[PDB]
């Protein structure tokens, strides 16, 4: 039932949402939507547990 | 006012006046130089911040 | 097709309070030109620049003003100040050597007085006279004026377009507002007579009883004719011959500014490229950018 | 005291963010800012009613109506255009209706 209220259906719109909140204002393209979520919880130099 | 060892001291209204005069100066320098409006727009929003 | 990634997203912008992400929103929309857009428009920038230099070549006083100023400084018996930089300066297509501004200066006298008799003789729009005014335009565009003194010689017409147009406006604000002359007939006389007071009673000759009650301003309407014809009386050059410089210079000027909007906005993010290698906290992120523009 | 002329007239913040200028003009505070921030034109004086006054017009549709009406319409964008919006209306006439 969480999948009921969702706007999107796949990765190509999932990185849209992670762009359309973490970076407001900016007209989103592909790699800037790929390279953000790449670097938030999988970057070596900007993450350490 | 001057402090002791060459160091000075200022209120917060000196520098905040400086960011308005220069933006009221750079906008003055754009109009005569027949600037593109996309420069003239982005000058105007910096004054709106200032 | 990049306007929709603005307008479908500027419809949904995240209540954006930062003005950089407004400026950076716009400067990424212009597409970048590679290796030829900076060349064919570099023509178009320069083409409209020297389009004006043919249309300022027509005004017969502007060449002689440059000479009459050159007549002053070299005849003051000592002049190597900052004036001699901005002057005539023919470029090879500089210390002004006083031997070469004399042997390359004889032609501006033989192109001066010959270009007077043939336009005087049997026609000023004359075709045989045209090819010495076509020959006068040869020896002046190689006299490439420095833009410090050249802008004055462009400005010498800009104050005369206005002085014509205000003396066009001083007929429209003094008669049409009050005496109620319908303008569909005054546009017949501007190319109709345009010399003297023969049009003045000609519009009265069309009876139209607003035209009878015109003895209070009898010294007030063709008075303004004699001062607009003072422009004729001071120049000796006809009114549409001004309006073939006013309509012939703008096209060279509306090519220049129109083209520089293409030469600037395709390269706006090269300005932001160096703008973050001096990003240390002197002024601002934006105060360098709007300086860099 | 000293005084500076401003190049363009800019809005006062205590009569914007508090609201005293949207409530005074029947417009949202968020729907003012897009006209201030040089994003969207607003109707100054519509002699032609194809666009009702006080309208947030994108740059895309800005070309569409311009070719239809030429110079017979009025549409500006910026914080001097909001001076023009404040300039147009009448106090006592718009008080008569309410």
């Amino acid at each position: 039932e969480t999948l009921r209220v969702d706007p999107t259906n796949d990765r190509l719109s999932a990185l849209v949402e992670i762009y359309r909140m973490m970076r407001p204002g900016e007209p989103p393209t592909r790699e800037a939507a790929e390279s953000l979520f790449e670097n938030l919880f999988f970057s070596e130099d900007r993450y350490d547990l | 006012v001057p402090l002791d060892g060459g160091r000075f001291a200022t209120s917060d209204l000196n520098d905040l006046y400086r960011r308005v005069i220069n933006r009221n100066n750079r906008l003055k320098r754009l109009l005569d130089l027949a600037a593109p409006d996309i420069i003239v727009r982005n000058e105007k929003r910096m004054l709106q911040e200032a | 097709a990049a306007a929709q990634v603005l307008s479908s997203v500027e419809s949904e912008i995240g209540r954006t309070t930062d003005p950089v992400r407004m400026y950076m929103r716009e400067m990424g929309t212009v597409e970048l030109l590679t290796r030829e857009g900076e060349i064919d428009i570099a023509k178009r920038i320069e083409d409209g620049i020297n389009q004006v230099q043919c249309s300022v070549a027509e005004y017969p006083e502007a060449i002689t003003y440059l000479l009459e100023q050159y007549d002053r400084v070299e005849a003051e018996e000592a002049r190597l100040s900052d004036l001699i930089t901005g002057f005539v300066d023919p470029n090879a297509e500089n210390s002004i050597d006083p031997e070469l501004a004399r042997e390359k200066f004889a032609e501006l006298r033989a192109q001066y007085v010959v270009t007077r008799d043939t336009i005087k003789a049997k026609g000023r729009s004359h075709a045989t006279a045209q090819e010495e005014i076509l020959k006068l335009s040869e020896v002046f565009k190689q006299f490439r004026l420095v833009p410090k003194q050249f802008d004055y010689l462009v400005n010498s017409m800009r104050v005369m377009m206005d002085r014509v147009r205000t003396q066009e406006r001083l007929i429209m604000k003094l008669c049409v507002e009050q005496c109620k002359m319908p303008k569909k007939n005054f546009i017949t006389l501007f190319t109709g007579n345009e010399t003297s007071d023969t049009w003045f009673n000609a519009a009265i000759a069309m009876n139209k009883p607003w035209s009878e009650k015109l003895h209070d301003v009898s010294e007030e309407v063709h008075r303004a004719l004699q001062k607009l014809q003072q422009i004729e009386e001071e120049t000796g050059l006809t009114i549409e011959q001004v309006k073939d410089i006013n309509r012939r210079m703008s096209i060279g000027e509306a090519k220049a500014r129109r083209a520089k909007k293409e030469m600037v906005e395709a390269n706006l993010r090269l300005v932001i490229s160096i703008a973050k290698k001096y990003t240390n906290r002197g002024l601002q992120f934006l105060d360098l950018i709007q300086e860099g523009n | 005291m000293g005084h500076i002329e401003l190049a363009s007239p800019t809005a006062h913040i205590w009569f914007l963010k508090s609201s005293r200028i949207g409530l005074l003009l029947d417009m949202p505070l968020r729907d003012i800012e897009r006209v201030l921030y040089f994003e969207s034109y607003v109707v100054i004086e519509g002699g032609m009613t194809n666009l009702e006054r006080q309208q947030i017009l994108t740059e895309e549709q800005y070309l569409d109506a311009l070719e239809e009406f030429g110079d017979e319409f009025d549409a500006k964008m910026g914080a001097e255009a909001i001076q023009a919006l404040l300039k147009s209306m009448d106090l006592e006439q718009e008080c008569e209706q309410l």
Side-chain angles (χ1 to χ4, degrees), chain A, chain B, chain C residues 1-277 282 285-293, chain D:
Chain A
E1 278 275 293
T2 317
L3 289 163
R4 272 299 167 269
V5 296
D6 200 85
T8 79
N9 67 86
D10 56 336
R11 175 200 212 248
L12 206 65
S13 199
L15 303 175
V16 164
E17 274 308 298
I18 307 187
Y19 209 93
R20 287 306 302 278
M21 165 208 55
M22 275 285 314
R23 267 84 175 265
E26 201 178 0
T29 53
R30 181 173 189 121
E31 50 272 6
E34 297 172 350
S35 317
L36 166 75
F37 179 67
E38 181 78 18
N39 295 352
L40 294 183
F41 313 97
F42 300 97
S43 177
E44 158 61 44
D45 55 324
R46 206 171 294 115
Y47 204 107
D48 197 1
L49 290 175
Chain B
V1 305
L3 293 156
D4 38 3
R7 37 196 297 174
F8 285 175
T10 167
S11 41
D12 284 291
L13 289 159
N14 272 25
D15 184 83
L16 266 174
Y17 277 157
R18 299 207 284 105
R19 304 220 193 210
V20 176
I21 300 159
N22 286 339
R23 281 164 202 176
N24 210 52
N25 282 341
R26 271 204 271 99
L27 189 41
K28 274 217 181 73
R29 303 222 328 282
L30 292 183
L31 298 183
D32 313 313
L33 274 172
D37 201 69
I38 193 159
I39 300 169
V40 170
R41 284 192 213 98
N42 196 31
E43 178 73 21
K44 280 179 176 187
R45 294 184 314 283
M46 282 150 72
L47 201 153
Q48 192 81 51
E49 210 191 40
Chain C
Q4 303 105 25
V5 81
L6 293 178
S7 296
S8 50
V9 155
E10 294 188 10
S11 311
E12 314 157 0
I13 38 171
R15 52 200 64 83
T16 295
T17 53
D18 160 62
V20 182
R21 291 150 105 95
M22 314 183 201
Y23 173 67
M24 193 181 172
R25 207 170 63 188
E26 308 155 2
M27 66 105 87
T29 68
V30 178
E31 217 194 357
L32 166 61
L33 50 85
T34 69
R35 198 47 190 165
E36 267 198 52
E38 67 258 34
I39 283 187
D40 56 350
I41 315 179
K43 296 182 175 186
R44 290 178 66 246
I45 287 160
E46 194 212 349
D47 289 318
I49 277 165
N50 51 71
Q51 266 205 2
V52 166
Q53 296 182 35
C54 317
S55 291
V56 68
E58 191 168 279
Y59 188 65
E61 265 76 26
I63 302 104
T64 53
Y65 297 146
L66 171 76
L67 304 179
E68 278 152 336
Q69 206 168 314
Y70 156 78
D71 280 11
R72 286 174 190 153
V73 284
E74 288 285 328
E76 272 170 27
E77 275 274 25
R79 182 58 61 243
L80 271 154
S81 319
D82 316 313
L83 302 96
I84 309 295
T85 293
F87 274 121
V88 182
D89 208 31
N91 43 355
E93 69 205 342
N94 275 136
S95 161
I96 306 308
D97 42 0
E99 49 90 17
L100 189 139
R102 292 309 191 277
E103 48 92 24
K104 283 176 67 71
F105 268 52
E107 61 256 40
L108 54 88
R109 261 151 294 279
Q111 283 290 333
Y112 176 44
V113 202
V114 166
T115 41
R116 295 282 180 257
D117 297 12
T118 323
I119 56 163
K120 271 293 205 301
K122 320 160 317 296
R124 190 181 173 93
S125 46
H126 200 87
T128 86
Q130 187 164 4
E131 64 162 27
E132 203 48 52
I133 316 294
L134 275 183
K135 213 56 189 300
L136 183 49
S137 45
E138 310 275 325
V139 302
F140 167 70
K141 310 178 196 175
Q142 60 178 26
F143 281 167
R144 271 305 308 280
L145 314 168
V146 184
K148 170 62 177 164
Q149 302 199 23
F150 177 54
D151 69 79
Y152 175 77
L153 313 166
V154 180
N155 283 303
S156 68
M157 172 56 64
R158 307 180 55 89
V159 305
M160 290 315 290
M161 180 263 292
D162 298 332
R163 187 60 188 278
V164 158
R165 162 72 181 220
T166 44
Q167 289 279 255
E168 302 170 11
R169 288 313 100 197
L170 258 58
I171 321 180
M172 310 324 164
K173 248 191 67 175
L174 213 53
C175 186
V176 196
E177 306 300 275
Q178 292 90 29
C179 192
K180 303 312 286 161
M181 176 259 294
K183 292 302 286 196
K184 261 293 164 164
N185 315 318
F186 199 85
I187 55 168
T188 68
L189 321 166
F190 182 70
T191 323
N193 308 328
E194 80 260 11
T195 68
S196 315
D197 292 1
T198 193
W199 71 267
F200 167 57
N201 203 74
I204 310 172
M206 285 148 195
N207 274 268
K208 294 166 188 169
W210 66 267
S211 275
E212 261 86 355
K213 35 166 182 285
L214 270 164
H215 47 279
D216 64 326
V217 300
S218 46
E219 213 196 331
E220 277 59 41
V221 43
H222 47 94
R223 186 189 314 207
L225 285 180
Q226 313 311 100
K227 309 313 286 197
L228 73 93
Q229 292 145 356
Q230 184 56 43
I231 298 164
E232 277 188 3
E233 272 152 340
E234 192 264 307
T235 54
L237 178 134
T238 66
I239 183 64
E240 283 83 41
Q241 266 166 325
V242 190
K243 299 310 285 296
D244 208 71
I245 306 177
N246 295 159
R247 290 201 71 255
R248 272 197 172 231
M249 173 257 313
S250 92
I251 172 63
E253 291 298 333
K255 199 66 62 185
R257 309 294 196 191
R258 177 71 206 182
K260 293 177 227 187
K261 303 308 159 269
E262 306 196 6
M263 204 45 71
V264 164
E265 282 156 37
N267 309 106
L268 270 169
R269 74 200 86 190
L270 195 88
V271 195
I272 212 170
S273 90
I274 324 176
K276 297 301 195 246
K277 314 305 167 206
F285 291 126
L286 279 182
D287 279 308
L288 316 168
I289 290 165
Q290 271 295 321
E291 177 45 53
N293 294 352
Chain D
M1 297 175 70
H3 97 277
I4 315 157
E5 301 302 298
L6 306 185
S8 206
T10 73
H12 198 258
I13 183 170
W14 280 350
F15 315 118
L16 184 76
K17 192 51 77 80
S18 152
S19 44
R20 307 308 181 279
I21 209 172
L23 184 88
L24 197 53
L25 206 69
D26 192 87
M27 213 47 198
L29 191 52
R30 294 186 188 173
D31 276 324
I32 281 288
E33 303 289 315
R34 324 174 58 192
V35 192
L36 299 183
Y37 292 146
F38 274 87
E39 152 165 2
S40 40
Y41 292 90
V42 75
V43 188
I44 318 180
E45 204 272 343
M48 319 304 141
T49 175
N50 194 14
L51 294 150
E52 159 67 58
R53 195 185 282 263
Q54 301 168 350
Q55 212 166 341
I56 298 191
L57 309 178
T58 82
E59 290 195 350
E60 287 192 11
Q61 52 186 354
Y62 192 61
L63 200 47
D64 196 270
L66 165 68
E67 303 310 305
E68 298 161 348
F69 295 92
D71 205 75
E72 277 268 22
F73 78 107
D74 218 5
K76 271 201 183 172
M77 174 192 47
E80 78 272 13
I82 203 176
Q83 189 169 79
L85 292 179
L86 287 155
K87 203 167 207 331
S88 72
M89 64 190 182
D90 198 357
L91 290 178
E92 47 89 14
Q93 271 185 4
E94 295 191 341
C95 164
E96 285 173 353
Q97 293 145 28
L98 301 183

